[PDB]
Amino acid sequence: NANVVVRLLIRRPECFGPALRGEGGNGLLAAMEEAIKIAEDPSRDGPSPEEDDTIHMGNAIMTFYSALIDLLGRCAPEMHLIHAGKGEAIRIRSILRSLIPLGDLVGVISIAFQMPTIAKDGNVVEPDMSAGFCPDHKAAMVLFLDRVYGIEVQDFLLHLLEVGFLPDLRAAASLDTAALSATDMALALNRYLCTAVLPLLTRCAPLFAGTEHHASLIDSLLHTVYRLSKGCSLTKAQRDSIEVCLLSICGQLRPSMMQHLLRRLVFDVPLLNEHAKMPLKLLTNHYERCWKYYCLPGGWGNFGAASEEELHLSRKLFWGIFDALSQKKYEQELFKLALPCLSAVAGALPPDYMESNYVSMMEKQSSMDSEGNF
Amino acid sequence: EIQFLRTDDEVVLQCTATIHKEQQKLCLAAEGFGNRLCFLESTSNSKNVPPDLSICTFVLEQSLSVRALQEMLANHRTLLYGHAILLRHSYSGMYLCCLSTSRSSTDKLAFDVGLQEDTTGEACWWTIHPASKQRSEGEKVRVGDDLILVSVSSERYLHLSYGNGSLHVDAAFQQTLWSVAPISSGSEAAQGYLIGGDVLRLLHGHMDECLTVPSGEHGEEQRRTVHYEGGAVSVHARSLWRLETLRVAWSGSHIRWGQPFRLRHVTTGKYLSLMEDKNLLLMDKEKADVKSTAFTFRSSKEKLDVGVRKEVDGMGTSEIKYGDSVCYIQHVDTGLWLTYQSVDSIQRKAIMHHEGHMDDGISLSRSQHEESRTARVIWSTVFLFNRFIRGLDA
Numbered sequence: 001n002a003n004v005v006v007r008l009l010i011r012r013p014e015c016f017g018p019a020l021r022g023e024g025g026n027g028l029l030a031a032m033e034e035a036i037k038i039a040e041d042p043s044r045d046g047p048s049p050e051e052d053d054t055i056h057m058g059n060a061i062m063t064f065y066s067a068l069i070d071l072l073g074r075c076a077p078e079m080h081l082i083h084a085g086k087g088e089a090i091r092i093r094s095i096l097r098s099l100i101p102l103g104d105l106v107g108v109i110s111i112a113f114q115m116p117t118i119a120k121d122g123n124v125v126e127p128d129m130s131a132g133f134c135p136d137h138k139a140a141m142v143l144f145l146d147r148v149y150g151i152e153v154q155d156f157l158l159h160l161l162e163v164g165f166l167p168d169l170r171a172a173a174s175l176d177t178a179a180l181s182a183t184d185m186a187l188a189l190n191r192y193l194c195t196a197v198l199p200l201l202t203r204c205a206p207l208f209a210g211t212e213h214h215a216s217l218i219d220s221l222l223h224t225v226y227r228l229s230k231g232c233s234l235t236k237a238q239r240d241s242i243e244v245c246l247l248s249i250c251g252q253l254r255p256s257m258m259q260h261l262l263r264r265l266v267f268d269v270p271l272l273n274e275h276a277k278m279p280l281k282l283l284t285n286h287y288e289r290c291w292k293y294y295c296l297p298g299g300w301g302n303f304g305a306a307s308e309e310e311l312h313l314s315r316k317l318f319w320g321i322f323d324a325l326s327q328k329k330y331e332q333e334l335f336k337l338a339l340p341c342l343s344a345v346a347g348a349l350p351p352d353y354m355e356s357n358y359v360s361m362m363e364k365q366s367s368m369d370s371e372g373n374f
Numbered sequence: 375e376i377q378f379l380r381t382d383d384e385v386v387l388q389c390t391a392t393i394h395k396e397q398q399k400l401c402l403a404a405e406g407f408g409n410r411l412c413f414l415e416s417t418s419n420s421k422n423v424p425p426d427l428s429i430c431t432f433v434l435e436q437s438l439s440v441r442a443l444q445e446m447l448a449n450h451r452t453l454l455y456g457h458a459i460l461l462r463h464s465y466s467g468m469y470l471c472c473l474s475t476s477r478s479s480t481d482k483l484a485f486d487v488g489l490q491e492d493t494t495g496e497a498c499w500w501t502i503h504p505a506s507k508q509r510s511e512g513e514k515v516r517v518g519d520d521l522i523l524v525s526v527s528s529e530r531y532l533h534l535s536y537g538n539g540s541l542h543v544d545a546a547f548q549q550t551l552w553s554v555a556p557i558s559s560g561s562e563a564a565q566g567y568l569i570g571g572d573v574l575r576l577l578h579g580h581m582d583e584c585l586t587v588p589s590g591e592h593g594e595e596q597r598r599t600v601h602y603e604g605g606a607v608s609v610h611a612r613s614l615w616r617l618e619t620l621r622v623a624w625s626g627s628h629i630r631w632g633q634p635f636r637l638r639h640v641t642t643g644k645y646l647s648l649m650e651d652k653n654l655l656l657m658d659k660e661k662a663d664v665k666s667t668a669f670t671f672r673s674s675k676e677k678l679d680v681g682v683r684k685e686v687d688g689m690g691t692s693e694i695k696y697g698d699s700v701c702y703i704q705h706v707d708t709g710l711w712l713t714y715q716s717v718d719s720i721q722r723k724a725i726m727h728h729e730g731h732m733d734d735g736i737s738l739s740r741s742q743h744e745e746s747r748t749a750r751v752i753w754s755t756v757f758l759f760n761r762f763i764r765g766l767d768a
Contacts, residue, residue, distance in 0.1 A: 007529060010529060010547050011547065013483065013547045013548075022481050022482050022483045022484070023480065023481065023537065024480055025482070087444070087447060087448070087496065091496070091527065091528075091529075094527075094528070095528065095529065098483060098485075098528070099483065101482075
């Protein structure tokens with residue numbers, strides 16, 4: 001049913017909309033921008049001479065193009081058939097690639113939303129969902145980009161992460177305030193990120209191996225995802241998806257890159273609240289994998305060794321977790337997940353390690369303060 | 375009684391243009407060396423500008439079913455609607471294909487149609503479908519049919535692009551009706567007999583002086599005259615002429631006495647013609663008119679007119695034999711006979727006379743395929759390099 005539909009749609013190219021007709025069509029990204037302008041303008045948006053009868057034409061165009069792209073992405077052949085080498089599947093994928101350029105998808109993803117804001121009186125002003133650009137529109141873009149073009153290059157992955165994925169994650173992490181948490185924008189953005197973006201980054205985890213040159217974007221991504229995980233309104237499925245994504249990425253990352261995330265973890269884990277569930281496992285996995293980096297003086301030959309600041313952080317984490325467990329009431333799962341982390345940290349730490357009297361200067365934990373995080 | 379397109383038949387693909395409310399017949403053309411792209415050659419203005427069918431002719435190698443072609447890719451037949459055909463360009467020996475690289479002729483979806491060397495892949499193969507509801511899948515394809523072609527690789531029709539200022543041929547989702555015209559059939563050809571589109575030498579006299587133009591004096595205006603010369607010029611490429619008939623369809627048939635044709639000088643690309651001052655001078659494709667550039671082969675000097683003969687829609691009967699037959703050239707309109715001025719290698723001038731000498735008969739010698747190919751290569755290369763030199767000089 002996919003091969004028939006694709007052939008029918010290419011037989012009648014008018015089905016693709018004026019942007020993609022091809023006789024001087026502006027393009028998908030230009031169509032989305034014109035839709036933004038139309039949805040902003042009152043005259044072209046409305047009839048301009050019961051409330052449900054109001055059709056926001058900008059949103060209508062956006063939804064049409066998003067639905068078309070989603071349908072084509074679903075019509076794209078499955079990966080295993082292409083690996084087997086079926087000529088018809090390869091040809092269908094080639095046709096879809098010809099129809100939709102990758103640059104247009106990247107641009108449409110790069111388009112940013114309009115975030116809700118709180119007013120002078122404290123009543124948050126909310127953009128109407130029935131009008132304007134919605135994350136569901138980008139969901140179809142991501143579906144097409146994953147099922148047709150595919151992300152198999154670290155350079156493409158990093159470029160996408162820098163241009164389109166990271167800004168939305170930052171917006172979600174910034175909309176985690178108490179008043180703005182339950183808003184429609186927040187819920188829609190969480191549903192988009194936890195079902196389209198994060199699973200993509202989880203499936204593309206191996207590409208994260210050789211990212212030494214991009215050592216800042218990875219750290220930004222880790223902190224943003226961790227803040228989103230600490231967010232409150234997230235459902236159980238969304239929380240699980242974030243946990244899986246973070247555990248997958250951190251496992252493939254280099255030992256040195258996780259220093260910044262370790263600095264945040266050593267300040268939140270000792271609380272041993274429910275939110276520490278995922279940090280405990282992340283620490284356990286990290287110190288089980290990269291144990292040679294810490295214990296042996298040589299460490300990993302390619303990776304190197306600790307800077308003794310990581311060692312200080314690790315010892316502080318170990319002792320904080322130990323004390324918190326000591327004065328914490330016995331919880332079954334909490335204890336059976338805290339014990340492996342303590343054991344892994346103890347194994348990783350060199351037995352004869354030097355406690356440096358040179359304490360850090362201006363430890364900026366108050367910078368990421370408990371309330372407001374900044 | 376009805377003719378079917380068969381494999382190993384040399385044909386051309388035609389399309390109709392409706393620019394500013396007129397019917398303009400166009401043929402698919404491509405030259406192997408240099409530009410691999412495909413362009414359109416006009417055959418509607420045959421009276422004013424001769425068409426270059428030599429780069430428009432194609433040959434049908436194989437006509438396999440879709441199932442058989444898919445099986446093969448996984449690993450004198452008569453064309454039937456729905457089969458996949460392989461077209462080989464006669465001049466270049468390369469096959470029509472979808473290049474998968476677009477020139478961006480205001481159509482992002484469209485692809486470019488060109489020529490490719492290898493046969494492997496699904497780009498070279500094209501499916502033939504009925505363009506008329508009278509025909510149906512599986513039926514034999516008549517010679518006088520409109521055919522719609524779909525690329526196996528991209529499912530894009532062979533499309534004629536009106537939208538751009540110049541006419542283009544491309545692979546697009548819109549469909550354009552193509553008509554296939556039978557140029558010639560290889561099997562019916564008779565050895566030693568002159569057929570249309572042969573590169574040949576016009577040998578004169580016992581000394582076998584061949585009708586040629588002045589040598590490479592670097593003067594494109596001095597090379598425009600015509601004279602009889604003997605010696606190494608009979609082996610050189612400056613004595614090669616291409617005989618082109620005035621008809622598009624069945625242009626590769628057997629040449630008959632009393633059949634008008636145009637003689638084209640291969641290396642210079644200019645057509646033989648008669649001046650108003652009664653002198654033989656080569657002019658250009660743009661100003662080669664039929665009235666000036668039409669010649670005839672006549673068996674004898676007799677003044678009896680050949681009258682009018684019904685043009686047979688077939689290969690015809692063999693009537694002119696290479697070497698054995700002796701022919702006399704006569705201008706179609708003026709009726710004058712080509713002759714030597716006999717004024718003094720030999721370098722005797724070719725003048726165009728009412729009566730002429732008694733020994734004005736010529737002999738016809740066919741040229742090897744390699745030699746003809748090399749001469750056209752020389753012409754196409756000198757054209758491009760002269761353009762390059764002029765641009766650099768500017």
